[PDB]
Write a protein that binds this ligand. Structure first.
Ligand code: CMJ
Ligand code: CL
Length: 117
């Protein structure tokens, strides 16, 4: 498991805020974590919200590739560059939908390392 244990407490406050803002349930997060994605704002806006909180996306859901790469371990760098080559730029009807399309692309491209917290 590539995910380090330190991340969980780091994101806790923002996670709670994002869920509350968007009406997100833990069940929805569990679902997307297992790779099942639907275009429901309560989960897609949650994903945008959490990325935004950690400066991974801007005000139009453009991904900051440098920041993203900086967060990922060494063994995932080339794979991420490859996945980002495929999945960026983001597109969609709004910020949450951009993130839905991105999540679908990333999950399909790298299912074995996919996760959502
Ligand atoms: C091939 C690699 C795929 C990457 C796995 C797919 C999901 C990864 C989610 C992105 C999180 C990146 C870092 C997560 C662990 C970092 C640990 C470092 C701790 C120090 C800082 C902690 C915070 C910066 C954590 C930030 C948490 C943000 C989670 C966002 C959840 C929504 C993800 C779904 C959207 C897919 C975007 C995906 C955008 C990336 C493009 C392709 C690699
Ligand atoms: Cl982008």
């Amino acid at each position: 498991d590539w995910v380090p244990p330190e991340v969980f407490d780091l994101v806790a406050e923002d996670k709670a805020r994002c869920m509350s803002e968007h009406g997100t349930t833990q069940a929805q997060i569990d679902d997307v974590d297992k790779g099942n994605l639907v275009n429901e704002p309560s989960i897609t806006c949650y994903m945008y919200c959490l990325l935004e909180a950690f400066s991974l996306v801007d005000d139009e859901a453009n991904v900051d590739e440098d920041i993203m790469l900086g967060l990922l371990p060494d063994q995932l760098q080339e794979r991420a560059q490859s996945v980002m080559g495929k999945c960026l730029p983001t597109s969609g009807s709004d910020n949450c939908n951009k993130i839905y399309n991105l999540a679908k692309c990333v999950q399909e491209s790298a299912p074995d390392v996919w996760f959502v917290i």
